[PDB]
Structures are given as structure tokens and as C-alpha cells.
Design a protein around this ligand. Structure first.
Ligand code: HEM
Ligand SMILES: [Li+]
Length: 386
């Protein structure tokens, strides 16, 4: 627990993959002091870890604080059986029928955003112009966040997501709860019909295994996830991958199977959430290391996704890869991303619109990355359009 590791250093965020690969070969499970946790780097160990009921997500200041009340009442930080009740209680937003509707909505929203870039424009910064914007348009039109309430919501989520005191974070999380409960009573903006939130709102008279107060907690989680840097990061990193791989732009334009695999290969190529957290409920052994009950683990999804044992030539962005769907960028098992299909639709329709209008995208200078590996996301992506 005293051996140095570079994994929590901002210096590796621009390109963490050679670091992951060097460390995995020698110490696939090892202690990272700045994370206060055991890093887990291989695909096999990350996948086992996500499936392991001995590893809890219940990670939970005065004891009645809102962070504790929130975490103990949302799917992301609870274990079965409560987790499973909480997850069933939001199923109405994410049915097969709902996704057939979101498919159509997201095709149009992505098309219209890309079409708003003048055809004669020669350059853009694809992060603010596109990657930051499409998730907001999707939040409004697919999820049903009222357009008129974005001024309230987005800056508060940005503050909560800061890489600012503990007091301020508790205040903004309190505000999200206030907003969520008032939204459901018609006191805030108008929720568009047939959206995720409209469906959840209509389901509230039918609760059987969760409480109205838990709906409020979970909606606060949804707002944080919606405006987190994860969706922008996926959009911008995939845009960079196409800009650096013109042969894959060609394959995308030539082959519907490549289009169909684009969301998953983009997600595999760069996990936005490069690691997620677990706590050992009981002693476990991983990577030859005895991890004791109570200790924290960081499962490096981003490393797993470039493990050559699962993905041959893992550093190739390859739309013809046959097993891209095995990526761990949405996790796996109990806590697998609630919005996985919504996100993959958003990604698919973005690249359809982008590469048909601007097949000639290329970088116009070096991309600039952020400094937080956990929520890894380009700050700027200067892009020539022609
Ligand atoms: C590219 C965008 C996104 C990525 C890469 C992503 C990634 C993830 C990952 C890795 C997990 C599993 C965490 C774990 O096992 O500890 C997860 C869970 C979750 N995600 Fe996403 N997410 C994205 C967008 C969203 C959005 C927009 C929403 C809005 C609803 C969302 C809602 C959730 C929820 C509620 C969970 C917890 C599910 C449960 O515990 O049962 N995610 N996500
Ligand atoms: Li940043």
C-alpha cells in the first residue's frame, strides 16, 4: 500500500492507455493512494468485479445529511433488494415502446443540430458546438427536462461534478431535490409529452415498492447523469476517433453494420467514466491481492475496454470489430447504465448526421483534454470540416 502508482495523476488523462497497459502486465490489481482504493485494470477482473455480489455499491458530516439520504435511496448507490425495487420503479421511462419513440426523436434532434452548422463553415470547436449541445437537446426532447429550466439545472450539476466546499455541494444537491418535487407538481417548467420524465410522472400513482420521496431522490440522480460530462465526452472522443481514422469514416459510409456498431466501438474506444467504485463487503482476492472487507476498489472500465485479451489490437478504432458490445463503458449487471440504449441512439444518430454532412472532418490543432480521469472529457476539439 506504499508502492507508487500514476493512476490518479492528471498527467495521464490525455492518453491513459499505455499507462494502463504497462501496469496491467505487472500489477493488474494494486493500491492507488490518492484514490484510497485498489485499482483493477484487466477486463476479466473488471467484469468479475461488476458481477461480484461481495462488492457493494453502497458507499453512502452530521448523520442526517442530504448526501447520505440521497445515496441510500437511488439505484446507483444501493444493493439488492432495495436497488431492484428502485430500478423497477423507473421502468416506465425505458420500455421497448419508449425507446422506439426516442429513436425517432434522437434521429431528428441530431440531424437538426448538425444541420445548424453552416455548410460553408470551415472549422468548429466540436466540444461546445456539438458534444456539449446534443446531450442538452436530448435532455429536453427525449428525457423531458423543460427547456426553460436549463438555467436552473445545468450550472448546479456542473458544481456538483467539480473535480467549492462540501457545504456548497450539499446546497446544490438540496436544490435538485426541491426542483424535482416541484417539477412533478407542475410548479416548474412544462415537461414535453412521451418523454422519460412524462412517463415517470404518469407512473407515480402506481408505486408498490418505493416511496414518492425516493422518486424525488432518483430524479435528482437523473438530472446529474443527464448534465454530467459523460455524454459530451463520448460524443467528442468518438468525433476525434473518426477525425483520426478516415478509413473508418469510409467504412461507416459504406456499411450499415459499421453504422450499427458505431456507438459501441466509440464507447469501447474511450470510456467516459474511466473507473467506477465498489467497496468490499467481504474479503476478496483479485490479481493475487487480498482485499479486505471495507476497502474500496476502482474498477478501470477504460482499461478493460483496451485489454488485448478481449479486444485484439485494442488501440485500433475499428467499426468492423465483431465484439464491441462487450465493452464495459456502461458497466455490466445489476447497475448497468439505465440510459444505455438512449445513449447509443444519441451517438448513432449524431455520427449519421455528422459524417454524411461533413465526411472530411479532421483535427485543426491538438485536442485538449480535461484533468479528471474519472469523468474524462475533451475540453476542446478544433475540427476542420472540409
Ligand atoms: C455516455 C454517457 C453515459 C455513460 C458512459 C454512463 C456510464 C454508466 C456506468 C459506467 C454506470 C455503472 C456504474 C457502476 O456500475 O458503478 C452507469 C449507471 C447508471 N447510469 Fe449511466 N452513463 C451515461 C449516461 C447516463 C444518462 C444520460 C443517464 C440518465 C438517466 C444515466 C443514468 C444512469 C443510472 C441511473 C445508473 C445506475 C443504474 C443502477 O444502479 O441500476 N447514465 N452509467
Ligand atoms: Li474541463
Amino acid at each position: 500500500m506504499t508502492v507508487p502508482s500514476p493512476l490518479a495523476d492528471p498527467s495521464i488523462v490525455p492518453d491513459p492507455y499505455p499507462v494502463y497497459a504497462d501496469l496491467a502486465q505487472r500489477r493488474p490489481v494494486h493500491w492507488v493512494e490518492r484514490l484510497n482504493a485498489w485499482a483493477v485494470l484487466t477486463y476479466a477482473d473488471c467484469a468479475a468485479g461488476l458481477k461480484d455480489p461481495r462488492l457493494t455499491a453502497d458507499r453512502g458530516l452530521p448523520p442526517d445529511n442530504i448526501f447520505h439520504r440521497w445515496t441510500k435511496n437511488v439505484v446507483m448507490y444501493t444493493d439488492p433488494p432495495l436497488h431492484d425495487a428502485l430500478r423497477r420503479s423507473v421502468r416506465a421511462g425505458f420500455t421497448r415502446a419508449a425507446h422506439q419513440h426516442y429513436d425517432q426523436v434522437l434521429q431528428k434532434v441530431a440531424h437538426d443540430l448538425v444541420a445548424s452548422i453552416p455548410a460553408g463553415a470551415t472549422e468548429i470547436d466540436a466540444v461546445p458546438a456539438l458534444a456539449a449541445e446534443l446531450p442538452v437537446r436530448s435532455a429536453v426532447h427525449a428525457f423531458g427536462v423543460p427547456e426553460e429550466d436549463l438555467g436552473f439545472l445545468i450550472p448546479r450539476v456542473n458544481t456538483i461534478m467539480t473535480y467549492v466546499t462540501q457545504e456548497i455541494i450539499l446546497e446544490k444537491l438540496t436544490d435538485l431535490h426541491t426542483y424535482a418535487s416541484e417539477l412533478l407538481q407542475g410548479m416548474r417548467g412544462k415537461v414535453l409529452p412521451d418523454t422519460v420524465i412524462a412517463r415517470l410522472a404518469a407512473a407515480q400513482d402506481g408505486l408498490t415498492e418505493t416511496t414518492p420521496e425516493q422518486t424525488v431522490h432518483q430524479l435528482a440522480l437523473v438530472f446529474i447523469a443527464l448534465f454530467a460530462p459523460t455524454t459530451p465526452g463520448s460524443l467528442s472522443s468518438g468525433t476525434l476517433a473518426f477525425a483520426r481514422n478516415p478509413r473508418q469514416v469510409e467504412r461507416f459510409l459504406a456499411d450499415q453494420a459499421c453504422v450499427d456498431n458505431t456507438a459501441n466501438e466509440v464507447l469501447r474506444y474511450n470510456a467516459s467514466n474511466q473507473f467506477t467504485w465498489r467497496v468490499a463487503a467481504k474479503d476478496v482476492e483479485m490479481g493475487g491481492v487480498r482485499i479486505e472487507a471495507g476497502q474500496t476498489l476502482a474498477l478501470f472500465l477504460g482499461s478493460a475496454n483496451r485489454d488485448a485479451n478481449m479486444f485484439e489490437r485494442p488501440n485500433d478504432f475499428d467499426l468492423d470489430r465483431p465484439n464491441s458490445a462487450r465493452h464495459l463503458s456502461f458497466g455490466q449487471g445489476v447497475h448497468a447504465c439505465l440510459a444505455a440504449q438512449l445513449i447509443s441512439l444519441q451517438l448513432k444518430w449524431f455520427y449519421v448526421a455528422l459524417l454524411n454532412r461533413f465526411p472530411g472532418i479532421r483535427t485543426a490543432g491538438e485536442p485538449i483534454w480535461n484533468e479528471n480521469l474519472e469523468f474524462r472529457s475533451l475540453r476542446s476539439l478544433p475540427l476542420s470540416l472540409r
